A = this chain, B = another copy of it.
Amino acid sequence: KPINVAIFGSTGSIGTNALNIIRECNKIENVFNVKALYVNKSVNELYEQAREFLPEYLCIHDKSVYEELKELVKNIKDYKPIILCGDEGMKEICSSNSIDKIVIGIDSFQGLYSTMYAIMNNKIVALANKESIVSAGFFLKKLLNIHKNAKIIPVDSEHSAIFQCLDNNKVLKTKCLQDNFSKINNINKIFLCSSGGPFQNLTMDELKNVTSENALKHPKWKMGKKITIDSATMMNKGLEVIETHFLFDVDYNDIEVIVHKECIIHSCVEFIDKSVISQMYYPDMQIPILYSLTWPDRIKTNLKPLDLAQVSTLTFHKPSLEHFPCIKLAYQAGIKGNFYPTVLNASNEIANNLFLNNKIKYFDISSIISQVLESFNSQKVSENSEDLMKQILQIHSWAKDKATDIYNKHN
């Protein structure tokens, strides 16, 4: 009964942690068949992975390196894969009857596209890309009601933790992103844990002058610059608030951000009786990824057991909204609903990059996002799925342009 898995974004942080835990688990017993690997342009790395996992399908997005990949894969003896390119190749892979589960480790806005096609092919979608949910949550809800056999299984660590705290006898009566998920699971409230990022103990005046260099300074987890910046501003956590609302149908007044600097308790679920269940481990994306691929079961690993006595102390505190104004903006956009989350995500893409490139200061990030949100006006939501997607693209693009206009006007 092998688990037939595609890795989308196989050469990045999520995709490499995915293949790492697949490789480790397979040494204990052969449970995973890596059926497909897909990247943008890392042709050499993709060759290396093909050599180890020998998947039925290989796909690279950039046409320019397609021929190169074909050439490299000739070196592999007794190995005749289907080698594909672009959106076309992504669609072929998602339509393959032999693939059951697709890890979406593709970053940014691009991630939404393969997520959509994985859903349209009624797959299990192990979704790490939170921006897809924040930008397109209602659309994805509509799409999951057309494609009844598709499921999104959360991989973002906090959302994986929440999901792991549930009773699957209740989860199996519903699915993530469905209205009423929280009611069917008897969920009352969520505690959404955060590392707090590097700036958690800075004063307002220190924040005024922090730089992206300071933000990119060996945090509790090593990741790409974009999510690292978001962790520093706590807009990551704001996006994760919206992600929680969409995935689990929890009201915004019932999502509490809590700063947990040790990063052992990964989030907690308060049920209607007031009992609280939490998921814990060392910080490591292997467990969230693995659970997304084994759910509703678990399998043996050789990971180091948690030593709670050694950890010794766990601490919890409320984040300061004045120091981390991005969090308030995310709640405000979420509560407004409509396409406000799309606008939040898009404007933050721009503001994050401005700050990364030393073009704006820390409080300018929230200033720009706030000004874009204030310029948007709620749009009638199309009932037509294709039209709705068009609206999300139009609004995303508008909001990025607006954020850049605001920066250029001031500058």
Contact = CB atoms under 8 A, between A and B. Distances in A.
Interface of A: 164-170, 172, 186, 188-189, 191, 258, 265, 268, 270-281, 287, 290-291, 294, 296-301, 303-306, 308-309, 311-318
Given A168-B170, A273-B303, A276-B280, 5 more contacts: A273-B291, A276-B279, A309-B318, A313-B316, A314-B315
A273 B296 contact: no
A271 B258 contact: no
Contacts of A280: 268, 275-278
Contacts of A258: 308-309
Contacts of A271: 298
Copies of this chain present: 2
Given A276-B281, A281-B276, A291-B275, A306 B167 contact: no
Nearest to A21: B273
Contacts of A164: 275, 277
B276 A301 contact: no
Contacts of A306: 270, 274, 276
A291 to B, nearest CB: 7
A153 to B, nearest CB: 15
Contact of A169 (B189, B191, B275, B296): B296
8 contacts: A268-B308, A274-B281, A274-B306, A275-B279, A275-B287, A277-B278, A313-B316, A314-B315
B189 A305 contact: yes
Contact of A272 (B188, B189, B298): B298
Nearest to A277: B279
B167 A168 contact: yes
A275 B296 contact: no
Contacts of A318: 309
Nearest to A170: B168
Contact of A308 (B166, B281, B304, B316): B316
A308 B191 contact: yes
A312 B316 contact: yes
B186 A298 contact: yes
A120 to B, nearest CB: 28
A149 B95 CA distance: 46
